[PDB]
Amino acid sequence: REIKIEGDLVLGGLFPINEKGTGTEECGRINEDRGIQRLEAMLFAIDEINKDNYLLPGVKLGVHILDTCSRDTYALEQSLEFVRASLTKNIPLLIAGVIGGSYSSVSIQVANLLRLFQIPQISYASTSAKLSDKSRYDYFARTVPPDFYQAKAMAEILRFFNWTYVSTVASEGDYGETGIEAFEQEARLRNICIATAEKVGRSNIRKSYDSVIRELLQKPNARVVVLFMRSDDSRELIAAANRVNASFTWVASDGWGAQESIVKGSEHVAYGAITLELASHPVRQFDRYFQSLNPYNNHRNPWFRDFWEQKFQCSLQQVCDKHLAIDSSNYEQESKIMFVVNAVYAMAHALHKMQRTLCPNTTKLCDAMKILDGKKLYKEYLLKINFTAPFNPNKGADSIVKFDTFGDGMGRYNVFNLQQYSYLKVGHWAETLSLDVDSIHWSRNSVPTSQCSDPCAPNEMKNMQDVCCWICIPCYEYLVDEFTCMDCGPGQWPTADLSGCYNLPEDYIKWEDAWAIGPVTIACLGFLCTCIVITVFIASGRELCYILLFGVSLSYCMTFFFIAKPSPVICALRRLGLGTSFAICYSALLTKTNCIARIPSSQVFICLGLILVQIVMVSVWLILETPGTRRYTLPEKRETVILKCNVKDSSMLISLTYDVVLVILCTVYAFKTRKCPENFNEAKFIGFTMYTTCIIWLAFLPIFYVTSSDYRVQTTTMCISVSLSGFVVLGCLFAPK
Amino acid sequence: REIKIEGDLVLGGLFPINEKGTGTEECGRINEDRGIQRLEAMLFAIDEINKDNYLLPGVKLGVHILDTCSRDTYALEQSLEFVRASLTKNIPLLIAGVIGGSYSSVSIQVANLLRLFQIPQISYASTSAKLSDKSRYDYFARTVPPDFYQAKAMAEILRFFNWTYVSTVASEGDYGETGIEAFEQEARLRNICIATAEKVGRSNIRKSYDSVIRELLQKPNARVVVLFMRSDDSRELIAAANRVNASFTWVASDGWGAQESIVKGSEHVAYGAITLELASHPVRQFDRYFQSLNPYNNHRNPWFRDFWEQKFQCSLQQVCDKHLAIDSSNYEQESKIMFVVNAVYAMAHALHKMQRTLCPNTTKLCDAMKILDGKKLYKEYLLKINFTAPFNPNKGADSIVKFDTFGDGMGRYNVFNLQQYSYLKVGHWAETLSLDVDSIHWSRNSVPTSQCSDPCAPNEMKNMQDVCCWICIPCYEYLVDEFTCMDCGPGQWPTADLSGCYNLPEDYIKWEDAWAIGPVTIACLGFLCTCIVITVFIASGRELCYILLFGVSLSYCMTFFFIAKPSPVICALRRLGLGTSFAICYSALLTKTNCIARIPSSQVFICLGLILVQIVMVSVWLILETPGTRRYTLPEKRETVILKCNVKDSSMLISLTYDVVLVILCTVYAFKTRKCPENFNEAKFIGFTMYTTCIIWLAFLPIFYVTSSDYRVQTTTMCISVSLSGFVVLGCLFAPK
Ligand SMILES: N[C@](CC1c2ccccc2Oc2ccccc21)(C(=O)O)[C@H]1C[C@@H]1C(=O)O
Numbered sequence A, B: 001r002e003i004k005i006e007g008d009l010v011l012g013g014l015f016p017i018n019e020k021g022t023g024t025e026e027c028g029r030i031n032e033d034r035g036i037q038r039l040e041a042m043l044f045a046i047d048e049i050n051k052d053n054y055l056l057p058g059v060k061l062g063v064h065i066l067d068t069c070s071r072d073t074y075a076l077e078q079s080l081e082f083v084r085a086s087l088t089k090n091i092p093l094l095i096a097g098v099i100g101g102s103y104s105s106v107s108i109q110v111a112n113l114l115r116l117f118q119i120p121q122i123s124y125a126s127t128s129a130k131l132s133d134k135s136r137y138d139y140f141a142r143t144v145p146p147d148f149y150q151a152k153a154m155a156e157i158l159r160f161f162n163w164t165y166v167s168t169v170a171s172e173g174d175y176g177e178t179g180i181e182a183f184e185q186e187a188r189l190r191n192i193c194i195a196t197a198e199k200v201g202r203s204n205i206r207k208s209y210d211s212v213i214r215e216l217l218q219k220p221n222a223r224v225v226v227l228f229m230r231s232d233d234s235r236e237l238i239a240a241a242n243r244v245n246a247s248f249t250w251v252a253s254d255g256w257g258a259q260e261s262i263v264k265g266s267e268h269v270a271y272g273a274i275t276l277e278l279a280s281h282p283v284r285q286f287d288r289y290f291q292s293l294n295p296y297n298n299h300r301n302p303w304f305r306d307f308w309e310q311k312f313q314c315s316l317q318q319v320c321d322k323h324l325a326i327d328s329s330n331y332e333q334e335s336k337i338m339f340v341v342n343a344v345y346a347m348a349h350a351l352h353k354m355q356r357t358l359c360p361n362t363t364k365l366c367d368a369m370k371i372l373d374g375k376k377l378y379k380e381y382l383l384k385i386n387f388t389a390p391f392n393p394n395k396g397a398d399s400i401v402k403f404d405t406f407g408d409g410m411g412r413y414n415v416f417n418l419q420q421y422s423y424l425k426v427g428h429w430a431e432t433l434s435l436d437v438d439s440i441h442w443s444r445n446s447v448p449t450s451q452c453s454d455p456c457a458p459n460e461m462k463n464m465q466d467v468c469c470w471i472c473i474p475c476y477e478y479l480v481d482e483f484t485c486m487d488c489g490p491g492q493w494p495t496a497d498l499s500g501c502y503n504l505p506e507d508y509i510k511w512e513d514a515w516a517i518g519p520v521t522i523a524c525l526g527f528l529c530t531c532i533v534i535t536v537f538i539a540s541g542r543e544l545c546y547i548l549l550f551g552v553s554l555s556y557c558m559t560f561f562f563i564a565k566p567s568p569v570i571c572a573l574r575r576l577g578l579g580t581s582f583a584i585c586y587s588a589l590l591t592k593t594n595c596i597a598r599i600p601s602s603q604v605f606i607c608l609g610l611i612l613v614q615i616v617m618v619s620v621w622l623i624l625e626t627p628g629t630r631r632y633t634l635p636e637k638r639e640t641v642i643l644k645c646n647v648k649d650s651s652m653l654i655s656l657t658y659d660v661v662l663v664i665l666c667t668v669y670a671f672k673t674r675k676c677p678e679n680f681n682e683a684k685f686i687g688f689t690m691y692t693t694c695i696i697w698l699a700f701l702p703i704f705y706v707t708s709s710d711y712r713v714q715t716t717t718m719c720i721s722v723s724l725s726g727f728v729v730l731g732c733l734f735a736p737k
């Protein structure tokens, strides 16, 4: 019927004593664990409340308890009796609040009804996430944490120390549907991707056996399936996976819990699972009180007599004995009794603080408590209570009953693990994990990684991504990005860590590569040959020799000029040196050839001859200002980009053109060999060699310009000019000595 | 008290008979317009329902009417009597549903209560947008449209034919706050920007006088302020704008409505406003019924006797007379009576269709209607009714009472306009506007535009945008975008509409620019001079003349070659022609000069001379393969990019270098003028002119290459060569004739 024991201030109680689904009446099959167990706990807490002298000395709390039959329709009809007394229209019971709850559907409906009439409601067990939406239930503060706190818990068991980052499984209804909706919002917001995310909806359907296959198909990035599914469906999935004989790490939810019956005959399939309980401490004072109850003593509860006729399979009025009593051998405590006493005390403490403030200096209630401020009672004292859970003498930091800003209890779960087969706690999610990692027995005897794409090394760092699945592309030029390569300084270039682009100074120089030594020997041989001639002969010929000697000296400088490192001005100056040296050598022959065909002072002719060489120098100087005396680097498709002076110097060939005309003009005077003195008096043997040397020098130059390596083409051409210069004098001075 | 007349099926009625705010009791000041007027309409509809024989023949509808006192707290306490009869716990009234409503706060609370017990509720007047959220009120279908339908209406009065697109004003509470939230979602989603969007919250505050200033400050893009504010606040704003003497076009909402009292003493300030009424047709049958009521006849309604003592300022039991009666002279109809009868008939029609289906072949009710299916009644018949509004004999398409999918009525408003000062309907928002634009008297006697940024023309199309405010940048290359310019074919380029970039063929050619005519005359003069010499002289000299004639002919081709349009091969071939012509002219002098210094057959020497000219041709042909016989265009910072052959032809100067050496080599033979026959036997007068001509030709060429215009430099240089060729022969043949 109803428990309506009188008191100064009366509390409300809705417990699923009878069970829904019995048939036409639907209000049969009285439930013990969810029911009398919880019901007597609320009665037990009230007995302790009035016994205690510090909560409410002059206020003895009354009780108004009504059945819910585990059905919302019957709960709403019953719950009207709480409203009926208040808002005057015997039942003279000023119901301060109700401690109803249990099944979320039942608690949601009474939350809608009691919100309208401004009565605070505390649900001892309703882990639904919908009830935390205060825009619809603003008079509903509960002691148990919601289920979206499990989503925020499992999504942190996967991120402890480089843990798994994949896969998800759901279930239909509201538990699986709403919880997974929170799991995804906790995985996306903290960098976790998901694999196949099916939803096993009905009890026994072909989807479940296909669900394992659909999860087994996604093999590489799914070895941790995040179950968020109910107990009956969990059995169906595990048995389905048992038949296929697969292996996973079932990161489960409260639905799986710590029940051994979930995995029966399939323990090795689920070995290594991770599940979360609700982390409730059994009240030991109530355990003695509940076991001390007697059918002939319990008169306050009308259901106890019928309860005594149900749990013993006897008729109190099979015939059971008189000395039968509840004992720890028969049945144990309900896993949520702590949350019931923490809900009765959540009002007595709230009512005590309200009584002290609004009616001070009075042991009993004052006239202001004849009308109870529903809004003030909820969001001033009830929503701000901070006492410690009674009858739990451990008195740890977790033993508080602080209500959240949304009227939720403090989230506290127990991470479990099935190791061979029994459940043993290996963690505690209060606000951050405290997992005993060493004690965890994993599925495959080692910690799974469950990462889709392996991280890419400093080499092969380029990635084509979903987010957790990239492609390790073999291409650090600027640490351009994890996902791109424009290939300025790529892996196919001599780059460096995060820095190396084509800017690298890969200039190529010879620096005495063992080939330039020959030009020095050739220059030395010519100087020795020139010194012997000077000594053996020490006029027009003397002046010509001096001009020829200057050309020989210029050739040596050119060999050394090319040997020097590239410079914007040094390289350009050395380029003009080659033209001046060639003109000087050619000019002396022209001057010598012009003096022979003279049948007009010698000094004036010598000055005129110098004027012929000065014109090329003036043109050479003018040509230098044409490029601004700059140098151009030499990049290419390959590495080792060179940094030298100007390349493709067509003006250098233009300078040779003036020498070629002078050389061609010298051949005009070279045709007078039959008209010139032979073997004496300025013999033409040297002139013939000079003409041949010019052709050889011209041929050598085109060959070097034809190639692109430029190893020793410039040095080789200079050696020919240096060798040719000594050859003209050597051929003429063959008879002397 | 309550009207509880018995009937087969009893309907519920909640009307704000008494008015909130009277003080301690709060349930005084009986309200007539919102109250007895609406109350008697529901009674009137019930009387017509039972009188009619087509709605419910064997079913006489009962009435259960309760007061709400225009307060949610009293409404919820009263509304429990509807629930009390059902869900058996005399009042044996099976309440099928309730026709309560009025003030949104009252209707919202009873919607929460009656949703739980599965009773359909129809509100005759609750235009709140919260009630359309079926996730919270799934048993609430109403006849009046919500207020977010006004947002979808005003945001379409601004988009009829290139109308205004700016500004917004709001108000505090729920009407202004929720409606403007919908107005912005209808403006953003259909391309409308907003100006200053303040919220005049309290009754009389300094914000309102500042609100006009804050709206007056944003002058250019705010001349249409979209009011969504209540009646009392609207008076305060308009009076505030009256003191400052501003002018706007107040696009208002239902709060302003058609009330003349909103604008009193400030009509000229608000002249031109646009406001929306609710577009309700006054029921004329009820107007006679309500006026026919008597205090000694109306016994069903207990409030009428007190109502008779309130509207007449008399005591029925000041003393009023017996013949006093309600008349059209005293008071008119409530603006929502139509929505009340459309709510009673919304259930009788819904119950009739339910009765026909569930209990067919029976004039009265059957046993299945002893228990009423709350869910089936709502979302099968009530949510799908389609009849026509009774007592409105216009019977237009708007006279239907179709319920929306969210249990809303059909949105139908009346666009108004205050023109001098009275309100006259100038539109009707059923689903699309039907504004009589010609009849609208605007604020400033003309249609306001109210656009922030003027649209940019095809010129100056570039824009820097908020969205509605851009900057008309003076920069159609490819119609790149409304908001960018990379300046490939910009306004500072000869572009075209949407197409013109630098790809435009702006090649520059002469095509007989009146300057090339001189080269033809010079060529003609030389041919005539050459023909005279040939005629007067018609051997070594003859062969030399033929070689010289070939050079003259080549010069004419070069002049015509440059005149031709640029070609990849034609332009390149003409470039090589200039070098061949110069070499041919120089070669003849060298051959002529070489024959004089011969003291070795004449035919062999003639062949040798041709070999000297063949070398340049071979080099010229080799040089052509160097560039591939291609042409390069000439672009620049300005327009008119040229498309010609290769430019900066350094190889062309290289060809002149060979001629210069030949010319220099010819000067060697030119020094023998003192040793050559003078005035006869191959006189050297022509040779001296040839040397001078070469220097002049060289000087002319550098000058043309120095410039960049290239107007007639090439033609001028060719003329000098053509003139020089005739000059050498003319100077030699001065004595003959
Ligand atoms: N915890 C419950 C049930 C919870 C749940 C919440 C919402 C929807 C479905 C749903 O079903 C499951 C399934 C598995 C585990 C927990 C739940 C609550 O109502 O919150 C409540 C029965 C528990 C009790 O009374 O002891």
Ligand SMILES: N[C@](CC1c2ccccc2Oc2ccccc21)(C(=O)O)[C@H]1C[C@@H]1C(=O)O
Pocket (backbone or CB within 6 Å): B034, B102, B103, B104, B105, B125, B126, B127, B128, B129, B173, B174, B175, B229, B230, B231, B254, B255, B336
């Ligand atoms: N239309 C009303 C009032 C509507 C409104 C709705 C929600 C919040 C505030 C609010 O205040 C205003 C102000 C100006 C115009 C209309 C409203 C409704 O409750 O919907 C209802 C009184 C009308 C009647 O019963 O005749």
